[PDB]
Enzyme design. Structure first.
Site, mmCIF file in Angstrom:
data_model
loop_
_atom_site.group_PDB
_atom_site.id
_atom_site.type_symbol
_atom_site.label_atom_id
_atom_site.label_comp_id
_atom_site.label_asym_id
_atom_site.label_seq_id
_atom_site.Cartn_x
_atom_site.Cartn_y
_atom_site.Cartn_z
ATOM 1 N N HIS A 1 -36.843 -52.204 30.968
ATOM 2 C CA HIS A 1 -36.949 -53.713 31.377
ATOM 3 C C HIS A 1 -37.828 -54.079 30.587
ATOM 4 O O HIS A 1 -38.432 -55.374 30.067
ATOM 5 C CB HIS A 1 -37.931 -53.744 32.984
ATOM 6 N N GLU B 1 -19.192 -25.726 36.780
ATOM 7 C CA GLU B 1 -18.339 -26.364 36.543
ATOM 8 C C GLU B 1 -17.657 -27.779 35.684
ATOM 9 O O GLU B 1 -18.718 -27.747 34.800
ATOM 10 C CB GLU B 1 -19.039 -27.395 38.366
ATOM 11 N N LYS C 1 -21.044 -57.918 39.679
ATOM 12 C CA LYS C 1 -19.987 -57.130 39.351
ATOM 13 C C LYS C 1 -19.928 -56.286 38.837
ATOM 14 O O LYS C 1 -19.606 -54.876 39.118
ATOM 15 C CB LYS C 1 -20.885 -57.885 37.209
ATOM 16 N N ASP C 2 -21.903 -55.723 39.338
ATOM 17 C CA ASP C 2 -22.055 -54.127 40.389
ATOM 18 C C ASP C 2 -21.502 -54.068 41.180
ATOM 19 O O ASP C 2 -21.013 -53.154 41.520
ATOM 20 C CB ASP C 2 -23.841 -54.505 40.781
ATOM 21 N N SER D 1 -31.887 -55.295 28.285
ATOM 22 C CA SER D 1 -30.518 -53.904 27.484
ATOM 23 C C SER D 1 -29.490 -54.819 26.645
ATOM 24 O O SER D 1 -30.654 -56.164 25.981
ATOM 25 C CB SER D 1 -29.938 -54.226 29.238
#
Ligand code: HEC
Ligand code: HEM
Ligand code: HEM
Ligand code: FES
Lengths: 416, 72, 244, 122, 364, 85, 383, 50, 39, 132
Positions: free
Chosen positions: G202, G272, G228-229, G206
């Site tokens: 923040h 894994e 969109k999320d 971005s």
């Protein structure tokens, strides 16, 4: 009072013995709405050329409205008849006057006006809002044309415009002041001589929710405007739309009454001084309208807050408007109508506009009776129909970085 | 007879499985020959047919698999 | 590693319960449990399955309860302190044939038959492997291989030598519904039952999965539509730059 | 990050020598054409990493017209990336319009910074 | 008409059925008190009475649909009101309680008056033409009519001064109620029974009107940013109001916005005859770009003089129209427009903006 | 910082740029979803393919060579070479 | 002001979700972060519902897991979620690192952010590994054993730290109990690290696929990139359901379903899947200390990346050579992951050594060399 | 003001108040499907408490 | 709110649709349909 | 750190006599896997001949075995724990199956990725009995 002369032209006059000054004007409809992109501004140029003629002591001025145009010769009462003849002459020789005219100087004058409406922030914002709202149709065009189109106009274009639109079926002689109507009608009849022709078909227009952002970061404020498809002069909601607009009324932060104005939005925006000023309006064209507000925000960080609060107050229109707000809006709209109809010039312009665009003019007493019939439920029905959840058109000029894009403001139109 | 054995018998007779069965059988023969010598116990590398058997069984499984449970 | 070490890869049989929307063939689960008790219970424990797990899967509650009474279980010793035993009940887990790993190794030449309650989720090929293992014994071990004493050759077993030795033979079990008892049929039934024992949630899991896919796919299509719709204003923006 | 002073130093190191110039410059144009930024309306200097005090000063000292043209080109590039479409060949930025407009200002900023650093260590 | 206080009442029918009531405090304008007191007083008029507070009176007025404002003019302080004919008994009473027993609370002087007055002054002066006109009045009528029309921090005013200027003014002889569209008898009754009846006949210790003392031949220059403006000012006796109204309309007047007039042929030019009780000022102004204004003011000067007496006579009817337009309810005008020639040689000059470009008075 | 809030995002003085848009509820949603998702997606894949294919081809060729060599080593013919390693 | 700004709590929620001025040109890749956060919830959520039934005792861990699967009502669902959701958590985290590597999201204004990123990565791996050890299957136990044996290679403290880790002399009850406690805990430390990640995001916002500044055109977040999320979240959940409900054990290893037995090592030991690459690196270096140092460097060299990246242009979207280098690096990382599960054999030892060599060479040679070359090429081409 | 871009092809063919009604329908359907899924998940988890 | 109640509509609709399609696709395999043969 | 409960059991015990001349019997020791073996006569001799210098690891069989034939080795085949396979590797002694590394009969990190000799589990033995 009405009298249809020979040639079929109609003389409409609203004579009042108390009038301070008299006015008489010829209006021939077909403003910018009748133009197209290539020849936009020709109506304003033609009206300016006609209004630049010798005034013989009167005050000859051009109207240049969106949908109608005309030349008005203001003059004192006793001189009115002379002015009558004057305008009649100016319109019986309109083609000759245009032909003998060097449009250069008139075109720089019209270009100066077009620049003026593109510099005065409110004029620019409202012109852009009208253009985007009715984009794709002639009604989007500027009233005075653009600087790019004005310079490209020639005498033959103005002659064609006059021949098409300056016809008996499309022209009205409006008058007001203190004079005998019959004298003015007789004086004009002997002098008015204009070509015959059918009233030009008024071009269609349809509202389109849109947003236009002319962000100029160099300006000192943010001049925005937001509106919905309003009510045209024909719609019976016309006065109802005005009442809805007046419910929110005007506001100027630095005015003394800023801390006392009734509207709730005024009290809301003064808590952090969100906005510098705003004014709600219901612009009405012949068949379509724009109902909304214009606003100037000084603090560039509070444009979003103002838009949010104003649209919430609009949401209140369909739910929670009280009889106090409705009564205040009714009284204020009646007073505004009576103020708009005081000056004889304004009365003449109003008579011409109504007679040309709706055919019949409701007297001021009839308008008062129609407004007083409005109840709060009628206003809320109108809010549901036309304001609640309807597409909005937006405009902004400077420091509009904080004006969130369309979807935010549009979604504000329906949240409770 | 159980379906699985007859499916193996049918598949090993298929042309695709034929070369693997061939190789496996001569591998068996070769390993038996290697076991015939008296020195077999001493050989470090005592061959076996595990790989050929695996190839044959893979090529037979690739045929039996899709068909078997239609038999049960 | 060598192909022998990894163990021949079991093929993919089209089990009735492979596809995304098929359950176990509960007829096959019952038949596989029959084969289990008849053959596998001699050596294999299968502890994590309680008789109650069989009610509504392969046996009616009365049958599971009755099978419970047929066995004996250790109860809390009597108030006099002497050991006491009770007939089995539904809550009791199925008992293995050996008391501890030591006994199992002793009775199987040291090999320890693993508990089968997870043998399907604890092997590479899963159900297929078990099937391929139970029917993978060749009548003649591949030439050249020498097995340690007690071991039998199974190509699908890693290393190639398995202490089990073939167990399933033709007509070894008389199925309760008259199904023929070919060795392949018994192997399929046992593999299916062991797969259930390792995945009792299989049917419920896949039904819940179908419901979840329906809901989430409809919701994902709705989200696609909503996003494209609310982004139409942005993807439809048109700019102009008109300096002097 | 590499300074425009050093980038230009290397570029002039190469350009001065005819062999390296002939070998590289065709490859330089080919690389800049395959880069694909011109198809989005961006000039090279629009791609520069703005988030540095030197570069921030460089933009802050641009003329008015160049600043507004840069703003419009950046906005057009954002819109094109947003709508997953490219400018047609006729509207793309031609090689001759990629004129390295911002380099002189960045070089001046780096000259000022380098003189300040040198004098602080006088 | 009049009441024992000698408060004049004038009432006459109106065209648009609005009772445009207005009160004209004769000599409480910007000429009377120290520079800027009248502005602050006008800002105090409608806020807190002895009968209704601001937030109550404004809300009630808006419910009633009426409008109210207080505008300061160099002669008089005007309290305009505009309302439907049914609403007279309310507003008139309010106006009484405005002239009498206005509260003048300090919290209004600091929150609603000084901020508002400063904002209005800054907004008005941002216009180069208005700044030039204020300077022209300052240099033509050195005191009285030349006092700045709006409050300026250069002349600090404390609340006590505004309160003591409300008192010692607002007297019966000093206020003239004018209405348009209200019966004169009903208005007389309402005024007589309102607070106007309690005002003293005359101020005991103030309102010593000073002579006009017109000065000519002066000049000034006021540097300013943005738009420039050059103005020329002729002081005129009241009896000459007719000559110059005809002259202004002959060349082009702000009241009559029209092309085809000689002054309208040059960008930004205009003229106007400001008219006051005891003097007037004829102002020819040009505004806009400094280079444009430099030639524009000289052209306007050459136009004002050398106006053909025939065209001047032709402009008589236009001047009569302009006078009729100007004669609003608040600013009653009685000027007989004659075509008599009007000289210009006695002009004051003021320049605003790019003083390096604008000419000096010696260049006309 | 290099990103302020909405009032001042750090963008340079922006001017002369006009942004037009139409509302939703007045635009064809998914206007060209079907045709675009095919043609434009193919265009994007065509542009970006080589960058993913050349590295993929190189790495997968190396992997295939290693895998085949490992498989060859553990066979009756790869025993000798396995011993030599 | 609106309630979403006046209230401090809603003010924070607004600053991060409703009015965060995201750039208008961000792809779907920028949604991965949200998914990661979503996954952090799921890992926690299902996680908190497994500890309600998981018993950390070594003699009960595996039986307790099987009790969850077989006896608890939706226990099978909760376990399959908590496991496949960890696998998907790492899928999304690798995609979020790949996006940050392709676009220059690690460059100047966000270097701090990048650092927390790396730390998160490191921390996450621990958590995942530790959680896996809780199952106490064969592969679980022997993975713990191998890890602790490798950490026993520290020069001097190595012999003493391992008993502190084991809580004894070998992976036993104390080890599993402490792993359970620290595994329940460290996810909340990771939530705090994610909060720090969001703060560092923040502060400077971005990046963009184009790399250029987004300040010229930024969009709110509530009507844009929240919907969109939702696409990204529902695609994530749809694939997550295709795994959880259908073939939920695909990502796991079958040997993990055999209860841990120290006396028999399984044929092969592999972590894994998502830890396979680093494991491969660990085996590429012969020395145990060398191996552990090289592995932790393979994770930490992301910190060096923002300084070795001498590129004047942010991101790869407009760079020819750097895109090839990035995809080659990604495919070598997948090759390392593949070699992690494969036995140490004749070709694979050399192939893994070369793959590790190139993995580090990427950061310390290829990124700087390629970035410098492309800077020079850009300048020469435009001139 | 100026000539707007032609959106004719982008414009919807459906009624002014109808398309928003359909948008309401699908947004509410998404909300209630999400509520049903959340109900199922929360019930499944809480059933472990029993 | 109406969200809580409305969620029941969709949940029940999908649940009944799937619990009616599943026992039709798999009717030959479920227990309740096979138990008759072994009784 | 090790709870005192774990430190208890640090020393285990063993019945050495039962195991055969040729058998390997894994048991758990020091709470850990341990490889316990009794040396074959040939194997014991082969080791005595083998050169310590030849091995990279610096260890010898004589130091590794306290009691000659009976010696103790920890279970982890490799320095990092590798489950120990039986009879495989460079000498055919053990296979570090976790990496397939080679562990010698000595138990040293002979081949593979091996690092050090299989620790002789520190130990003492009584008659046909053992401790570790
Ligand atoms: C008698 C003893 C039996 C019987 C009747 C069955 N099995 Fe099997 N089992 C047995 C031994 C000695 C072993 C040792 C395995 C080894 O040597 O490694 C096993 C092992 C299994 C396995 C393990 C397979 C693997 O680990 O790869 C499975 C699986 C298994 N047993 C299953 C099984 C089934 C399904 C049977 C059906 C009747 C069955 N066993 C019978 C000894 C015996
Ligand atoms: C990002 C954070 C986390 C990640 C990546 C993660 C991942 C994992 C993984 C991969 C496993 C292996 C389980 C298996 O293979 O069966 C596991 C086990 C486990 N985790 Fe998590 N986990 C996280 C947070 C949590 C939290 C907050 C809890 C709180 C209780 C938790 C509780 C458990 C439990 C109890 C197990 C035991 C597994 C079982 O009994 O089946 N985890 N975790
Ligand atoms: C639970 C794990 C994580 C969460 C919840 C998280 C959160 C976020 C969010 C919400 C974003 C904005 C959306 C986006 O850019 O995709 C973001 C971006 C980012 N992620 Fe993370 N993050 C996590 C882990 C990581 C890790 C492990 C790394 C690197 C090792 C990392 C590197 C980044 C970077 C550098 C950005 C900025 C991207 C840009 O601005 O272009 N993140 N993160
Ligand atoms: S097996 Fe000993 S190191 Fe991994």
């Amino acid at each position: 009072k009405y009298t249809t002369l020979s040639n079929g032209v109609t003389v409409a006059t609203e004579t009042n013995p108390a009038a301070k000054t008299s006015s008489v004007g010829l209006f021939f409809g077909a403003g910018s709405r009748s133009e197209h992109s290539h020849s936009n501004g020709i109506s304003a140029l033609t009206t300016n050329v006609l209004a630049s003629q010798s005034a013989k002591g009167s005050l000859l001025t051009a109207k240049n409205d969106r949908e109608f145009n005309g030349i008005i010769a203001q003059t004192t009462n006793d001189n009115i008849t002379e002015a009558g003849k004057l305008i009649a002459s100016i319109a019986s020789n309109a083609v000759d006057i245009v032909e003998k005219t060097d449009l250069t100087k008139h075109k720089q004058y019209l270009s100066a006006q077009a620049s003026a409406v593109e510099a005065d922030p409110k004029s620019k914002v409202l012109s852009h809002l009208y253009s985007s709202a009715f984009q794709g149709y002639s009604l989007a065009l500027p009233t005075l044309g653009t600087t790019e189109s004005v310079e490209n106009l020639e005498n033959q274009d103005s002659l064609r415009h006059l021949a098409k639109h300056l016809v008996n079926n499309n022209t009205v002689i409006a008058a007001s002041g203190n004079f005998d109507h019959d004298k003015l009608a007789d004086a004009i009849e002997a002098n008015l001589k204009i070509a015959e022709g059918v009233k030009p078909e008024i071009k269609p227009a349809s509202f389109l929710g849109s947003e236009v952002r002319m962000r100029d970061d160099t300006l000192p404020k943010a001049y925005i405007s937001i509106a919905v498809h309003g009510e045209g002069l024909n719609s019976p909601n016309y006065y109802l739309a005005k009442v809805a607009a007046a419910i929110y009324g005007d506001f100027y932060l630095h005015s003394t009454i800023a801390k006392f104005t009734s509207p709730k939005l005024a009290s809301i925006v003064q808590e952090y001084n969100i906005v510098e000023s705003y004014n709600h309006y219901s612009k009405s064209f012949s068949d379509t309208g724009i109902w909304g507000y214009y606003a100037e925000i000084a603090d560039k960080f509070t444009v979003d807050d103002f838009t949010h609060f104003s649209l919430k107050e609009w949401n209140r229109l369909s739910i929670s408007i009280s009889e106090a707000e409705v009564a205040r809006a009714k009284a204020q709209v009646k007073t505004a109508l009576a103020k708009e109809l005081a000056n004889s010039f304004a009365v003449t312009s109003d008579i011409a506009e109504k007679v040309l665009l709706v055919g019949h003019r409701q007297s001021l007493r009839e308008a008062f009776e129609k407004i007083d019939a409005i109840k709060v439920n009628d206003v809320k029905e109108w809010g549901k129909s036309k304001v609640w959840d309807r597409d909005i058109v937006i405009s902004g000029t400077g420091l509009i970085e904080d004006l969130l894009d369309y979807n935010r403001n549009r979604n504000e139109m329906a949240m409770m | 007879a159980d379906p699985l054995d007859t499916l193996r018998e049918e598949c090993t007779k298929t042309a695709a499985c034929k070369p693997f069965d061939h190789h496996f059988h001569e591998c068996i023969e070769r390993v038996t020959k290697e076991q015939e010598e008296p020195d077999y116990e001493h050989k470090h590398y005592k061959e076996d047919c595990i790989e050929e058997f695996f190839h044959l069984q893979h090529c037979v499984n690739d045929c039996v698999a899709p068909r078997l449970f239609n038999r049960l | 590693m060598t192909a022998a070490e990894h163990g021949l890869h079991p093929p993919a049989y089209n089990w009735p319960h492979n596809g995304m929307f098929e359950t176990f063939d509960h007829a096959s689960i019952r038949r596989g449990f029959q084969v289990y008790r008849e053959v596998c219970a001699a050596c294999h424990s299968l502890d994590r399955i309680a008789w109650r797990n069989l009610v509504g899967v392969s046996h009616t509650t009365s049958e599971a309860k009755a099978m419970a009474e047929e066995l004996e279980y250790d109860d809390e010793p009597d108030d006099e302190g002497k050991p006491r035993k009770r007939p089995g009940k539904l809550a009791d887990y199925i008992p293995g044939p050996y008391e501890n790993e030591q006994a199992a190794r002793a009775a199987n030449q040291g090999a320890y038959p693993p508990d089968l309650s997870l043998i399907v989720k604890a092997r590479h090929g899963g159900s297929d492997y078990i099937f391929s293992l139970l029917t993978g014994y060749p009548d003649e071990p591949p030439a050249g291989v020498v097995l340690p004493e007690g071991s039998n050759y199974n190509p699908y077993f890693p290393g190639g030598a398995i202490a089990m030795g073939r167990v399933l033979f033709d007509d070894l079990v008389e199925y309760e519904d008259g199904t023929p008892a070919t060795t392949s049929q018994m192997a399929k039934d046992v593999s299916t039952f062991l797969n259930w024992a390792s995945e009792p949630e299989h049917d419920d899991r896949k039904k819940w999965g179908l419901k979840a896919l329906v809901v989430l796919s409809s919701l994902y299509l709705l989200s696609i539509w909503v996003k494209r719709f609310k982004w139409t204003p942005i993807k439809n923006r048109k700019f102009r730059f008109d300096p002097p | 990050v590499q300074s425009m002073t050093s980038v230009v130093k290397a570029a002039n190191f190469i350009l001065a020598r005819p062999t390296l110039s002939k070998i590289i410059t065709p490859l330089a144009q080919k690389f800049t054409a395959y880069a694909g930024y011109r198809e989005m309306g961006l000039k090279f200097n629009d791609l520069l990493l703005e988030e540095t005090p030197i570069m921030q000063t460089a933009i802050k000292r641009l003329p008015s017209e160049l600043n507004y043209s840069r703003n419009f080109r950046i906005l057009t590039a954002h819109q094109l990336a947003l709508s997953h479409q490219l400018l047609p060949a006729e509207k793309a930025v031609k090689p001759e319009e990629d004129d390295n407009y911002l380099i002189p200002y960045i070089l001046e900023a780096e000259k000022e910074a380098f003189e300040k650093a040198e004098l602080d260590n006088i | 008409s009049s009441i024992p206080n000698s408060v004049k009442i004038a009432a006459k029918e109106s065209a648009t059925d609005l009772t445009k009531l207005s009160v004209i405090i004769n000599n409480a304008g910007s000429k009377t008190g120290k520079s800027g007191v009248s502005h602050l007083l006008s800002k105090f008029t409608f806020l807190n009475n002895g009968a209704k507070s601001a937030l109550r009176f404004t809300r009630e007025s808006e419910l009633l649909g009426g409008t109210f404002e207080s505008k300061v003019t160099r002669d008089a302080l005007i309290l305009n009101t505009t309302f439907l004919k049914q609403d007279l008994p309310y507003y008139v009473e309010a106006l009484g309680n405005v002239v009498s027993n206005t509260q003048f609370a300090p919290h209004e002087f600091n929150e609603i008056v000084l901020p508002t007055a400063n904002a209005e002054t800054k907004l008005a002066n941002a216009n180069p033409a208005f700044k030039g006109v204020e300077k022209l009045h300052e240099i033509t009528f050195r005191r009285g009519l030349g006092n700045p029309l709006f409050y300026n921090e250069s002349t600090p005013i404390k609340l006590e001064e505004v309160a003591q200027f409300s008192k010692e003014q607002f007297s019966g002889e000093n206020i003239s109620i004018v209405a348009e569209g209200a019966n004169e008898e009903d208005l007389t009754k309402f005024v007589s029974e309102s607070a106007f009846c309690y005002l003293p006949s005359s101020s005991s210790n103030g309102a010593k009107a000073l002579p006009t003392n017109t000065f000519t031949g002066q000049e000034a220059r006021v540097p300013s940013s943005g738009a420039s403006s050059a103005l020329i000012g002729i002081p005129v006796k009241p009896a000459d109001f007719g000559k110059y109204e005809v002259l202004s309309a002959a060349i082009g007047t702000s009241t009559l916005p029209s092309t085809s007039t000689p002054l309208a042929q040059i960008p930004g030019a205009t003229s106007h005859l400001y008219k006051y009780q005891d003097a007037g000022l004829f102002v020819i102004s040009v505004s806009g770009e400094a280079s444009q204004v430099a030639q524009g003011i000289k052209q306007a000067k050459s136009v004002a003089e050398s106006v053909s007496s025939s065209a001047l006579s032709e402009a008589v009817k236009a001047a009569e129209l302009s006078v009729a337009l100007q004669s609003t309810v608040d600013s009653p005008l009685n000027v007989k427009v004659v075509a008599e020639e009007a000289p210009i040689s006695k002009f004051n000059y003021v320049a605003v903006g790019d003083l390096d470009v604008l000419p000096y008075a010696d260049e006309l | 910082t290099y990103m302020g809030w909405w009032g001042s995002l750090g963008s340079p003085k922006q001017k002369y740029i006009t942004q037009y848009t139409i509302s939703p509820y007045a635009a064809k949603p998914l206007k060209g979803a079907a045709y675009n998702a095919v043609f434009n997606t193919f265009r994007r894949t065509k542009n970006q393919f080589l960058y993913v294919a050349i590295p993929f081809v190189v790495v997968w060729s190396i992997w295939t060579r290693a895998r085949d060599y490992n498989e060859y080593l553990y066979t009756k013919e790869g025993r000798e070479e396995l011993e030599r390693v | 002001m609106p309630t979403r700004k006046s209230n401090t709590y809603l003010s924070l929620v607004n600053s991060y979700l409703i009015d965060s001025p995201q750039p208008s040109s961000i792809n779907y890749w920028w949604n991965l972060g949200s998914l990661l956060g979503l996954c952090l919830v799921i890992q926690i959520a299902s996680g908190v519902f497994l500890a309600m039934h998981y018993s950390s005792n070594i003699e009960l861990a595996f039986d307790s897991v099987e009790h969850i699967m077989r006896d608890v009502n939706a226990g099978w669902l909760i376990r399959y979620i908590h496991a496949n959701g960890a696998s998907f958590f790492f899928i999304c985290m690798y995609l979020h690192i790949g996006k940050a590597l392709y676009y220059g999201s690690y460059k100047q204004p966000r270097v701090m952010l990048w650092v927390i990123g790396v730390v998160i990565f490191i921390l996450t791996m621990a958590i995942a590994f530790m959680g896996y050890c809780l199952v106490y299957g064969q592969m679980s136990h022997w993975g713990a054993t191998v890890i602790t044996n490798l950490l026993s290679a520290i020069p001097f403290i190595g012999n003493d730290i391992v008993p502190f880790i084991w809580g004894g002399f070998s992976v036993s009850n104390p080890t599993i109990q402490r792993f359970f406690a620290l595994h329940f805990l460290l996810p909340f430390i990771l939530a705090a690290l994610v909060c720090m990640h969001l703060m560092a995001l923040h502060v400077h916002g971005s990046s963009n696929p184009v790399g250029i500044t987004g300040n010229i055109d930024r969009l709110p977040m509530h009507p844009y990139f929240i919907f969109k999320d939702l696409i990204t979240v529902f695609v994530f959940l749809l694939i997550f359901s295709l795994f959880v409900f259908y073939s939920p054990n695909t990502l796991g290893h079958p040997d993990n379903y055999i209860p841990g037995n120290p006396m028999v090592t399984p044929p092969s030991i592999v972590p894994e899947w998502y830890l396979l690459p680093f494991y491969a690196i660990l085996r590429s270096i012969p020395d145990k200390l060398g191996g552990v140092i090289a592995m932790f460097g393979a994770i930490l060299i992301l910190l060096s990346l923002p300084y070795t990246d001498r590129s004047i242009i942010r991101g790869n979207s407009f760079k020819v050579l750097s895109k090839l280098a990035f995809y080659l690096f990604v495919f070598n990382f997948i090759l390392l992951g593949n070699l992690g599960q494969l036995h140490v054999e004749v070709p694979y030892i050399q192939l893994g050594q070369f793959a590790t060599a190139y993995y580090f060479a990427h950061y310390i040679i290829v990124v700087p060399v390629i970035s410098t070359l492309e800077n020079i090429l850009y300048y020469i081409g435009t001139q | 003001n100026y000539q707007q871009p032609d959106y004719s092809s982008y414009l919807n063919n459906k009624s002014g108040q109808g398309s928003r009604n359909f948008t309401y329908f699908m947004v509410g359907s998404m909300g209630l499907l999400s509520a049903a899924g959340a109900k199922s998940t929360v019930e499944a988890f809480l059933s472990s408490f029993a | 709110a109406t969200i809580f109640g409305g969620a029941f509509a969709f949940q029940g609709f999908f649940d009944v649709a799937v619990n009616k399609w599943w026992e039709e696709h798999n009717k030959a395999k479920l227990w309740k349909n096979v138990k008759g043969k072994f009784l």
